[PDB]
Amino acid sequence: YDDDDKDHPFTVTIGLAHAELIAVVTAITTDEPRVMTVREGAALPSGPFEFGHRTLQSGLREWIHEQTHHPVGYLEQLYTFADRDGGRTISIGYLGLVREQWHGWYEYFPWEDHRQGRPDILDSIIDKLRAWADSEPDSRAQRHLRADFTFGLDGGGWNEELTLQRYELLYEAGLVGEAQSEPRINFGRPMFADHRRILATGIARLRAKIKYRPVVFELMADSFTLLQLQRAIEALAGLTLHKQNFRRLIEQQQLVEETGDMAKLFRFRQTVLDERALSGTKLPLSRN
Amino acid sequence: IGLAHAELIAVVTAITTDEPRVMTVREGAALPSGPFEFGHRTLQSGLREWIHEQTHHPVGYLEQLYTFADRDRNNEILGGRTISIGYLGLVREQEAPKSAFWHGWYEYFPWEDHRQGRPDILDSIIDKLRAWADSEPDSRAQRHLRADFTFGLDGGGWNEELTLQRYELLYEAGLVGEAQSEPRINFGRPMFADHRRILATGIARLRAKIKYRPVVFELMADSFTLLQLQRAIEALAGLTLHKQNFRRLIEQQQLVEETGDMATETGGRPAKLFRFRQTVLDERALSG
Numbered sequence A: 001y002d003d004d005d006k007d008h009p010f011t012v013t014i015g016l017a018h019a020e021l022i023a024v025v026t027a028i029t030t031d032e033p034r035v036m037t038v039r040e041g042a043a044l045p046s047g048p049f050e051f052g053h054r055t056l057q058s059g060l061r062e063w064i065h066e067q068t069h070h071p072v073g074y075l076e077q078l079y080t081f082a083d084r085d086g087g088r089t090i091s092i093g094y095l096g097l098v099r100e101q102w103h104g105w106y107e108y109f110p111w112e113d114h115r116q117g118r119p120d121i122l123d124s125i126i127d128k129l130r131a132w133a134d135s136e137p138d139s140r141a142q143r144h145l146r147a148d149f150t151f152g153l154d155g156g157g158w159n160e161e162l163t164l165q166r167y168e169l170l171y172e173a174g175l176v177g178e179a180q181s182e183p184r185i186n187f188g189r190p191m192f193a194d195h196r197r198i199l200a201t202g203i204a205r206l207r208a209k210i211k212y213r214p215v216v217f218e219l220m221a222d223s224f225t226l227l228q229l230q231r232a233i234e235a236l237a238g239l240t241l242h243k244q245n246f247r248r249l250i251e252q253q254q255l256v257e258e259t260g261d262m263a264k265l266f267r268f269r270q271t272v273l274d275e276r277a278l279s280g281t282k283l284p285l286s287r288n
Numbered sequence B: 001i002g003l004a005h006a007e008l009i010a011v012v013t014a015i016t017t018d019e020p021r022v023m024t025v026r027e028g029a030a031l032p033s034g035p036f037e038f039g040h041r042t043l044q045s046g047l048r049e050w051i052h053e054q055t056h057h058p059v060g061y062l063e064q065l066y067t068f069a070d071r072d073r074n075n076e077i078l079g080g081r082t083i084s085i086g087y088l089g090l091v092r093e094q095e096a097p098k099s100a101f102w103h104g105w106y107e108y109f110p111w112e113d114h115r116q117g118r119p120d121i122l123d124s125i126i127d128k129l130r131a132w133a134d135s136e137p138d139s140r141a142q143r144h145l146r147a148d149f150t151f152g153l154d155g156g157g158w159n160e161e162l163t164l165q166r167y168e169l170l171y172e173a174g175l176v177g178e179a180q181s182e183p184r185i186n187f188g189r190p191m192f193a194d195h196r197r198i199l200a201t202g203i204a205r206l207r208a209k210i211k212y213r214p215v216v217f218e219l220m221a222d223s224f225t226l227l228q229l230q231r232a233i234e235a236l237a238g239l240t241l242h243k244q245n246f247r248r249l250i251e252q253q254q255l256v257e258e259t260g261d262m263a264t265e266t267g268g269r270p271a272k273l274f275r276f277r278q279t280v281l282d283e284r285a286l287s288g
């Protein structure tokens, strides 16, 4: 009334949404990949992005400290998600590698650990996925291709880097508690909000990192054997690696060097440590 | 508390006349961008609506880059913080006399193109970068380490993947127009708001992807020669390829197959036409 026009040059309407910083801090203990959690393993360390926070990273470092009091080293940004409660909440995830001084990855993602063959839980997951892919005929062919590429429903090799794609398919198929399907079906331990979605991106990032350049000095002690180096990468990838081919990748990437002490002990080169100190949190990558 | 305004920013890249070009608005002054709104189902779907409304140019797959936050002062006037979310997309450039203009990557980042040798502008950049590094002795040593690692002075040479880290250093040093330094110093064509920071992220992403697995079928025509593919990667990297190592890489990765047809080059010699084999197209499709 009294001319309240639609758009107005002297009026700017700004949309706001909740900004949540979420932390995926990973450590390797007893050849088991383990993630920092709060609320008795139901949530990741998280907190809102506030005015007093100088940066996103420094803001998350305060929440990690207040909620865990566990020191963290370098951080790298993962993925940014809109809520699926696309409305009110924007979540920003970060990955960190530390030495444990905690819950396991495969408590939340038991189907991702193939170190001792395929997990038998995958038979039930595939059975539910085939029923969902066959539920609507016009989308049957595409859903079978997605389920084959991710889980290998009608065959197809297992790709460990597709942790996120596998969790997104289970969510769309209503096979995880976070989807909240009418008959609730769930595999693995669920988490608060979409924290398992965040964790999936951290597992995918680490696995993609260790396949072409395993810069994991923060996960190891200062000295280690090459077989200890293989055991922890095998724990991260959820696969058993070939000895000969793993030795070639490490020497090819000039990552480690002999310390002279005794199997031979190795340490990551100082150049690898110095480059990481200057690379920041927005690393040049190929996927994320 | 914990609110933020999200701007979705698009880096849509095409390769025309062996030159990498980015889609822009306002006659090359800004990238296509728009706020994230409540009705936007996802961050990617929200940006697609801004791309269409502002350019009306078709866009294929989109890949999230990184999220940046503001360092402003009176964000409390806005009700929350301000963040920027970038996305990278590869398309074929299309003329249509909508309003949108295609500009080359290196109009904004001239120091990133080393195809014709190291550019001369880097001599003026390194000079002003040293003067900034020597201005404050307590931080001189650390600033020289950042200047050596980012701008090729390291000894390891020029790293084309560090496009964002180079630009961020130039911003902190007050060597770009977006810094608004007390004496204005700028290299390359500036952009609106922080969009040149977003473009540097997309350039770094593409260069890291093509180094490991150049899945660039969206940038190429349906069929192409191997020389056309090499010129495309070279334009993206700002470097000249090792021909034999590049041919060996795309064969090991099983990326392109012969179409059976022939093409006559400019000089007059015929050459086999290639296409990205279907398995490469299907893998990129089975995601998001």
Ligand SMILES: Nc1ncnc2c1ncn2[C@@H]1O[C@H](COP(=O)(O)OP(=O)(O)OP(=O)(O)O)[C@@H](O)[C@H]1O
Residues within 6 Å of the ligand: A055, A056, A057, A058, A279, A280, A281, A282, B068, B071, B167, B168, B169, B171, B172, B194, B197
């Ligand atoms: N708008 C901007 N455009 C370009 N560079 C910027 C901008 N704002 C800050 N920078 C620079 O970017 C660098 C990184 O700061 P930023 O606020 O992005 O987060 P950060 O946690 O310090 O990053 P990192 O530790 O990953 O380098 C700093 O050198 C800063 O001066």
Ligand SMILES: [K+]
Residues within 6 Å of the ligand: A017, A018, A019, A020, A047, A048, A049, B001, B002, B003
């Ligand atoms: K919040």
Ligand SMILES: [K+]
Residues within 6 Å of the ligand: A056, A057, A077, A281, A282
């Ligand atoms: K950051």
Ligand SMILES: [K+]
Residues within 6 Å of the ligand: A051, B070, B071, B072, B073, B074, B075
């Ligand atoms: K502020």
Ligand code: NA
Residues within 6 Å of the ligand: B109, B112, B162, B163, B164, B166, B167, B200
């Ligand atoms: Na740069």
